[PDB]
Design a protein that fits this description.
Elements: E1 5-7, E2 21-27, E3 32-37, E4 43-50, H1 64-72, H2 84-91, E5 95-100, E6 105-112, H3 116-125, H4 134-152, H5 155-166, H6 181-190, H7 195-206, E7 212-218, H8 222-233, E8 258-263, E9 270-278, H9 288-296, H10 304-310, E10 317-325, E11 328-336, H11 339-342, H12 345-362, H13 366-381, H14 388-399, H15 419-426, E12 435-439, E13 449-450, E14 457-462, H16 465-472, E15 507-511, E16 515-521, E17 529-537, H17 545-571, E18 574-581, E19 584-592, H18 596-608, H19 614-630, H20 636-648, H21 655-662, H22 667-679, E20 680-689, H23 693-711, E21 714-715, E22 733-740, E23 747-757, H24 760-784, E24 791-798, E25 801-810, H25 814-834, H26 837-852, H27 858-870, H28 878-886, H29 891-902, E26 910-917, E27 935-936, H30 940-945
Helix pairs in contact: 1-4, 2-3, 4-6, 9-15, 12-16, 17-18, 17-19, 17-21, 17-22, 18-23, 19-21, 24-25, 24-26, 24-28, 25-29, 26-28
The chain binds ligand MGH and zinc ion.
PDB class: hydrolase/hydrolase inhibitor
Keywords: insulin degrading enzyme, hydrolase, HYDROLASE-HYDROLASE INHIBITOR complex
Assembly: monomeric
């Protein structure tokens, strides 16, 4: 029948709740393809995943395949304009990214449903005939440098590369994947390399159809999608590349029984234990590493972590199999350390080996396998519908590992019980096979070695044989038991029939002094799941830095106390989130609705009768202390956002104020605060999902009754429901606040042009403006001017007020970044004047689609309502209202707006700038306007005191 297609392949197994339709196939040139038809979708999407990545970089050009990934976006033969692809997505409500791992390069986009073909045609050109323009290459090489720079002082990245640096140095594993200006420009020039050629050469060599999978998701039929994919992808050449394989483990004998002592950037204490294992991927139908992961990483009674945490040695643990590449994997067990734990690392590892030994002694357990199989089956059956862009990206990666027919199920379904494989993996978790890393600031000064790409400081030792031998003779230890049946496993999936009184938006079904209950029975998704959100108000949670600290610790203590019991709930797809806010606390319980009341009842009950174990108190207080200190090591752009938040909010305690007040938090003082906090509250709740009104009222009243029974709670008075205001900046003012980041050698800037209170029309002026400037801000400040990797723009909403912000992290100083942004704003007014009426309407259409995009799953719909409730705007039909209004706007409206509120000589410009300086300070380019001298903020309190505050926004 069809020369262009090798194979069609059978029905693709899907959940029976999945109304989308699917066709797998294989093109003549080798491309594995999944087509997904969703006739209701708002965005379409596609992804392409090439089975090549940085493990295949040339040894003399670290980061080449990552760099290539950047360059594919910057023009092809059919679409030579550098930003054709970006701007097309932007004008049709889409977005795109890409990533490169050791074996893959993965490219995906979404777009408005009726412009799939447009988007896909541009996308296909990436794989056919990229330009790699010489001038683009010179520019983009900075963005890749900047990306690396952002990672340099991050502990996760450093450990990630330290591991690669300590295996076999001639194994591809040890390569440097990101690349930087040095590896991608400086040194190749020094060595006579034409990088445009090396990119042409690599693309030509590795971008072979036989190494590619594609997924496309759209409203079209399967037949129409098929024709489409054949049309744009049959022409990719098959150069028949063998798939790279790495049968030899980068950790050989010389790499085993080694100890590493590493100095962190942040003040953290961790121990990483690693064993090399073979590639388990081919055993996916039984998944022996998941079985052992489930056991070793367990957190219930009888578990490894239970005992380490009781000895006061660790607070958290992670264990299980870790991806390597084709040919090798790892098995890891990593824990954080208390100060005691740091001195007992040897005993910790013995306990690990005792627990593994217990697994050997009891042997593989079919009922445990049975449990995971069941959980996986229920999860698969009732999986949330995914956002298109993530779904295609994720399936494109897995098309390389699974038969077409299984790609949806493979990662979920379990079919084979394999005590042999389990035994075989257990036989590698042995002291003679072990690598041990200790990350601690106590190693400062004591190290003698330095990792080349990140500068990490470490020491490497043989673990002494006395130590191996002691671990090899690990007896059983009776504190360690396998877990018992998981009683939280759900079994009731009945979907309650939709009630006669069901509304499309949440309804206020209870409005008392104690509690305000918003409710909606799910009428869209029909999965046996529910979301229960509660905001608890207490003035005592933020009355001062000390109380804030206590609110925090109280909740951390509570979570830590519930963990053993909650963990079973989590494996059963039932979880919770519990945190202190500047208003009091937030509690959310999400998941299968079956056993939800039980978990929820337990939490409130513990909350109200809580008894603190003081060793837990002391460990958590110390972790929190480190945690506040560690803020100093966050990125300059985060610092900028943090300072602006502190400047524009009526009330806010700084981390310094918090750390200072922390020494005063005693056990006595915390026991006193808890009943104080719970004595008067107000509760506002959204209960949303597979539940009825009457079950909702029941749950609300149960939460209330428990607080009353156990903590005597009474109502707050309507007047004590303080929501905080934003600072109101003067017409034509400009304020700068400046700080130094002490760890990172970039600077950060945030610029905020405050506009006015939120409301239908102020909202849409800002949003439309943001839409129009979005891609060009990126295209100009990043792609042309190459000011940094991080370059953001868009609305700021806080405390009912709003405005336009830019964020940039750069090597260049902030005074300079200011001026490039102002230069950019002029370029924007000129281009709004110059654009066609129709280009104008496309932006409207594009924002329109963004706003009207239906939530694909329960919790996305909850989040939307929840934001209407926490903001106290309660505007559930906001998207229709605001989109109706948006369709009436014109170029004259936006030009006016820009001229009123935004332009440099705007009558109502209100500008504030946070400059975060790098670790050590004290052309083709458009003209930047002359700026006024700013008012430099010296003291955040004086500043606020000296300014009006805005009203709060009226409801409805
Ligand atoms: C089945 O395996 C598991 O149950 C858990 C282990 C665990 C410990 N405590 C609670 N659960 N999860 C994992 O092992 C998770 N896995 C990550 C993932 O699921 O994507 C990993 O092992 C990777 C850990 C890692 C290493 C380095 C940097 C980031 C993350
Ligand atoms: Zn990148």
């Amino acid at each position: 029948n069809n020369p262009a297609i090798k194979r069609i392949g059978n029905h693709i197994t899907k959940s029976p709740e999945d109304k989308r339709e699917y066709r797998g196939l294989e093109l003549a040139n080798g491309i594995k393809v999944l087509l997904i038809s969703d006739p209701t979708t708002d965005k379409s999407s596609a992804a392409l995943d090439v089975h090549i990545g940085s493990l295949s970089d040339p040894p003399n050009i670290a980061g080449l395949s990552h760099f290539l990934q950047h360059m594919l976006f910057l023009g092809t033969k059919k679409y030579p304009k550098e930003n054709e692809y970006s701007q097309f997505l932007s004008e049709h409500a889409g977005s795109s990214n890409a990533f490169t791992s050791g074996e893959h390069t993965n490219y995906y986009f979404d777009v408005s449903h009726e412009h799939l073909e447009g988007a896909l045609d541009r996308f296909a050109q990436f794989f056919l005939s990229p330009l790699f323009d010489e001038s683009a290459k010179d520019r983009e090489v900075n963005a890749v440098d900047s990306e690396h720079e952002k990672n340099v002082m991050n502990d996760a990245w450093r450990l990630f590369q330290l591991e690669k640096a300590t295996g076999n140095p001639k194994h591809p594993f040890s390569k440097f994947g990101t690349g930087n200006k040095y590896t991608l420009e400086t040194r190749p020039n020094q060595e006579g390399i034409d990088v445009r050629q090396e990119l042409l050469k690599f693309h030509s060599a590795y971008y072979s159809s036989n190494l590619m999978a594609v997924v496309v998701l759209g409203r079209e039929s399967l037949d129409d999608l098929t024709n489409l994919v054949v049309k744009l992808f049959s022409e990719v050449e098959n150069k028949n590349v063998p798939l790279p394989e790495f049968p030899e483990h980068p950790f050989q004998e010389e790499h085993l029984k080694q100890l590493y002592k590493i100095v962190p950037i942040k003040d953290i204490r961790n121990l990483y234990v690693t064993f090399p294992i073979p590639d388990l991927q081919k055993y996916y139908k039984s998944n022996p590493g998941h079985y052992l992961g489930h056991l070793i990483g367990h957190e219930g009674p009888g578990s490894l972590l239970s005992e380490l945490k009781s000895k006061g040695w660790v607070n958290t643990l992670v264990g299980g199999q870790k991806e390597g590449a084709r040919g090798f994997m790892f098995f890891i067990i990593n824990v954080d350390l208390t100060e005691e734990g740091l001195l007992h690392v040897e005993d910790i590892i013995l306990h690990m080996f005792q627990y593994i030994q217990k697994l050997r002694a009891e042997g593989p357990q079919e009922w445990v396998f049975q449990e995971l199989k069941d959980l996986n089956a229920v999860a698969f059956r009732f999986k949330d519908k995914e956002r298109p862009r993530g779904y295609t990206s994720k399936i494109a990666g897995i098309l390389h590992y699974y038969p077409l027919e299984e790609v949806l199920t493979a990662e979920y379904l379990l079919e084979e019980f394999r005590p042999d494989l389990i035994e075989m993996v257990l036989d590698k978790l042995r002291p003679e096979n072990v690598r041990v890393a200790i990350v601690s600031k106590s190693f400062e000064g004591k190290t003698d070695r330095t990792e080349e790409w990140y500068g990490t400081q470490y020491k490497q030792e043989a673990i002494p044989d006395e130590v191996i031998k002691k671990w090899q003779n690990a007896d059983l230890n009776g504190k360690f038991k396998l877990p018992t049946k998981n009683e939280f496993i759900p079994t009731n999936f009945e979907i309650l029939p939709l009630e006669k009184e069901a509304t499309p938006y949440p309804a206020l079904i209870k409005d008392t002094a104690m509690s305000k209950l918003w409710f909606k029975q799910d009428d869209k998704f029909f999965l046996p799941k529910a979301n229960l959100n509660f905001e608890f108000f207490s003035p005592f949670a933020y009355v001062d830095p000390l109380h804030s600290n206590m609110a925090y610790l109280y909740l951390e203590l509570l979570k830590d106390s519930l963990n053993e019991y909650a963990y079973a709930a989590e494996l059963a797809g039932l979880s919770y989130d519990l945190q202190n806010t500047i208003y009091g606390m937030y509690l959310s319980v999400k998941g299968y609705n079956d056993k939800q009341p039980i978990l929820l009842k337990k939490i409130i009950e513990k909350m109200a009768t809580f008894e603190i174990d003081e060793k837990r108190f002391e460990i958590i207080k110390e972790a929190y202390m480190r945690s506040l200190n560690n803020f100093r090591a966050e990125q300059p752009h985060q610092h900028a956002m943090y300072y602006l938040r502190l400047l524009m909010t009526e009330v806010a305690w700084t981390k310094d104020e918090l750390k200072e007040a922390l020494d005063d938090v005693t056990l006595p003082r915390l026991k006193a605060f808890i009943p104080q906090l719970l004595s008067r509250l107000h509760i506002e709740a959204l209960l949303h999902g597979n539940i009825t009104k009457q079950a909702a009222l029941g749950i609300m009243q149960m939460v209330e009754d428990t607080l009353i029974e156990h903590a005597h709670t009474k109502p707050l008075l309507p007047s004590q429901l303080v929501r905080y205001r934003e600072v109101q900046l003067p017409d034509r003012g400009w304020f700068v606040y400046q700080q130094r980041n002490e760890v990172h050698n970039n600077s950060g800037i945030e610029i905020y042009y405050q506009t006015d209170m939120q409301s239908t029309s102020e909202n849409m002026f800002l949003e439309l403006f943001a839409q129009i400037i979005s891609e060009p801000a990126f295209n100009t400040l990043r792609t042309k001017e190459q000011l940094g990797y991080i370059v953001f723009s868009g609305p700021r909403r806080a405390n009912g007020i709003q405005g336009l912000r830019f964020i940039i992290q750069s090597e260049k100083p902030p005074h300079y970044l200011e001026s490039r942004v102002e230069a950019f704003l002029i370029t924007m007014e000129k281009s709004i004047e110059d654009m066609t009426e129709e280009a104008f309407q496309k932006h409207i259409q594009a924002l329109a689609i963004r706003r009207l995009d239906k939530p694909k799953k329960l919790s996305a719909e909850s989040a939307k309502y929840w934001g209407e409730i926490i903001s106290q705007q309660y505007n559930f039909d906001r998207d229709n209202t605001e989109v109706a209004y948006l369709k009436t706007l014109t170029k004259e409206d936006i030009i006016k707006f820009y001229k009123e509120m935004l332009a440099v000589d705007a009558p109502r410009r209100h500008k504030v700038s946070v400059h975060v300086l790098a670790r050590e300070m004290d052309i083709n380019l458009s003209q930047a306007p002359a700026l006024p001298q700013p008012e430099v903020i010296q003291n955040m309190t004086e500043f606020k005191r000296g300014l009006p505050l805005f009203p709060l926004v009226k409801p409805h």
